[PDB]
Write a protein that binds this ligand. Sequence first.
Ligand SMILES: *[C@@H]1O[C@H](CO)[C@@H](O[C@@H]2O[C@H](CO)[C@@H](O[C@H]3O[C@H](CO[C@H]4O[C@H](CO)[C@@H](O)[C@H](O)[C@@H]4O)[C@@H](O)[C@H](O[C@H]4O[C@H](CO)[C@@H](O)[C@H](O)[C@@H]4O)[C@@H]3O)[C@H](O)[C@H]2NC(C)=O)[C@H](O)[C@H]1NC(C)=O
Ligand SMILES: *[C@@H]1O[C@H](CO)[C@@H](O[C@@H]2O[C@H](CO)[C@@H](O[C@H]3O[C@H](CO)[C@@H](O)[C@H](O)[C@@H]3O)[C@H](O)[C@H]2NC(C)=O)[C@H](O)[C@H]1NC(C)=O
Ligand SMILES: *[C@@H]1O[C@H](CO)[C@@H](O[C@@H]2O[C@H](CO)[C@@H](O[C@H]3O[C@H](CO)[C@@H](O)[C@H](O)[C@@H]3O)[C@H](O)[C@H]2NC(C)=O)[C@H](O)[C@H]1NC(C)=O
Ligand SMILES: *[C@@H]1O[C@H](CO)[C@@H](O[C@@H]2O[C@H](CO)[C@@H](O[C@H]3O[C@H](CO)[C@@H](O)[C@H](O)[C@@H]3O)[C@H](O)[C@H]2NC(C)=O)[C@H](O)[C@H]1NC(C)=O
Ligand SMILES: *[C@@H]1O[C@H](CO)[C@@H](O[C@@H]2O[C@H](CO)[C@@H](O)[C@H](O)[C@H]2NC(C)=O)[C@H](O)[C@H]1NC(C)=O
Length: 286
Amino acid sequence: NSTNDDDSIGTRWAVLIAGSKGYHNYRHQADVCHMYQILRKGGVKDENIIVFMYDDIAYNESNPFPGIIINKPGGENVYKGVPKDYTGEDINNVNFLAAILGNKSAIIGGSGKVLDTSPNDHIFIYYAXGAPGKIGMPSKPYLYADDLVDTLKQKAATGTYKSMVFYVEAANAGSMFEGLLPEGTNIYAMAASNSTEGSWITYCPGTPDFPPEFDVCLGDLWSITFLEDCDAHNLRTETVHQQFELVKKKIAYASTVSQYGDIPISKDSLSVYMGTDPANDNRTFV
Ligand SMILES: *[C@@H]1O[C@H](CO)[C@@H](O[C@@H]2O[C@H](CO)[C@@H](O[C@H]3O[C@H](CO[C@H]4O[C@H](CO)[C@@H](O)[C@H](O)[C@@H]4O)[C@@H](O)[C@H](O[C@H]4O[C@H](CO)[C@@H](O)[C@H](O)[C@@H]4O)[C@@H]3O)[C@H](O)[C@H]2NC(C)=O)[C@H](O)[C@H]1NC(C)=O
Ligand SMILES: *[C@@H]1O[C@H](CO)[C@@H](O[C@@H]2O[C@H](CO)[C@@H](O[C@H]3O[C@H](CO)[C@@H](O)[C@H](O)[C@@H]3O)[C@H](O)[C@H]2NC(C)=O)[C@H](O)[C@H]1NC(C)=O
Ligand SMILES: *[C@@H]1O[C@H](CO)[C@@H](O[C@@H]2O[C@H](CO)[C@@H](O[C@H]3O[C@H](CO)[C@@H](O)[C@H](O)[C@@H]3O)[C@H](O)[C@H]2NC(C)=O)[C@H](O)[C@H]1NC(C)=O
Ligand SMILES: *[C@@H]1O[C@H](CO)[C@@H](O[C@@H]2O[C@H](CO)[C@@H](O[C@H]3O[C@H](CO)[C@@H](O)[C@H](O)[C@@H]3O)[C@H](O)[C@H]2NC(C)=O)[C@H](O)[C@H]1NC(C)=O
Ligand SMILES: *[C@@H]1O[C@H](CO)[C@@H](O[C@@H]2O[C@H](CO)[C@@H](O)[C@H](O)[C@H]2NC(C)=O)[C@H](O)[C@H]1NC(C)=O
């Protein structure tokens, strides 16, 4: 009965979630904070960015730089300005699925910020921290693939978006979408690993160039590969497909970057979802 038209050009929205907790899982919250920095430098408003992060890293007693979170040795503080929509045990299936669906009544804790999107809007979902057919939540119950796909199908039915890009960093990340995500939903998915592979961590203690102050890994290989790609050039000149082929080639030695769902959605430039940093205009992707 509802209308599929609106007088809006289209707003960029994002959901960023680190599914883990504990100081040793520093990498997942750093990844999600680095993605937030990419979005706000691209003009995505805080009001449209839903952040799920346990928030036990920046001021952890073990953190050598309190108030700071970095996602690469010698990198910049990515914790600065990150909204705190769902922190602690408010990062769960109930709140995560209600946020994607956009049901404020289903939210049991947290900010209550959900994807109250409209037909011309674009959604970018990024999850960091997996097993065959499931991805973690800081505490049990975990997020099972069938539940995530039921929510994405309910969201597709509403027609409250033009297109959605879902990036998953986890082991067996592909298993969340393989043979489940129907085409026609306008949802493109990119995963660090296929349904049967584990995913690599990077920026870990061990190499002689690692900072002595840190005892934890700063990032996840696929995440830092695509995040460092987004910071380097004008995202209006690089498509999601061009990023997929770049990261897939760049980390082929570790895992197989896989794509699922509505593949033609990947024809859009990354700026459709992330905007672009006005300081990177004179740097085109070649
Ligand atoms: C998609 O959704 C639309 C919105 O919900 C649907 O519109 C609705 O259509 C139905 C008929 O299919 C209308 O039903 C009743 O309409 C009047 C009431 O109108 C007034 O009150 C409404 C609130 O109750 C307001 O919303 C209206 O603006 C208006 O002020 C009743 O008098 C009717 O009663 C008659 O019919 C019944 C049997 O059906 C008899 O038993 C009664 O005795 C009487 O003869 C209807 O019950 C409804 O008003 C309408 N809503 C609007 C706002 O337009 C639309 O139908 C739907 N499309 C499809 C395909 O399902
Ligand atoms: C800094 O990181 C620490 C390590 O990840 C983290 O320690 C963890 O703290 C939680 C909360 O106290 C402990 O979990 C406990 O949760 C409830 C608390 O009442 C208990 O019922 C449980 O039995 C459980 O023990 C973890 O055990 C603890 N982990 C470790 C390794 O010590 C700190 O909390 C983090 N600090 C900040 C500022 O967030
Ligand atoms: C948004 O989240 C809402 C809360 O989780 C949810 O509302 C709940 O909807 C169910 C039905 O789907 C209702 O459950 C039962 O309620 C009636 C009355 O008691 C019973 O007769 C039925 O058996 C029914 O199953 C809940 O009562 C209802 N809760 C509230 C507070 O309204 C919405 O459905 C969710 N919306 C969407 C679009 O997903
Ligand atoms: C996920 O990526 C895996 C690569 O990391 C991939 O594994 C590879 O799968 C092929 C089969 O498709 C294996 O080859 C098989 O067949 C040859 C003969 O043609 C035999 O000699 C082999 O022993 C084997 O049975 C590759 O060996 C295998 N490589 C590894 C390292 O596992 C998975 O198939 C991918 N999974 C999904 C769900 O796509
Ligand atoms: C792309 O790079 C810079 C980006 O600024 C541009 O070059 C100079 O930019 C400063 C201001 O930032 C101006 O003062 C200069 O006059 C700019 N030069 C020119 C020729 O525009 C420029 O837009 C691009 N550079 C090149 C070499 O094309």
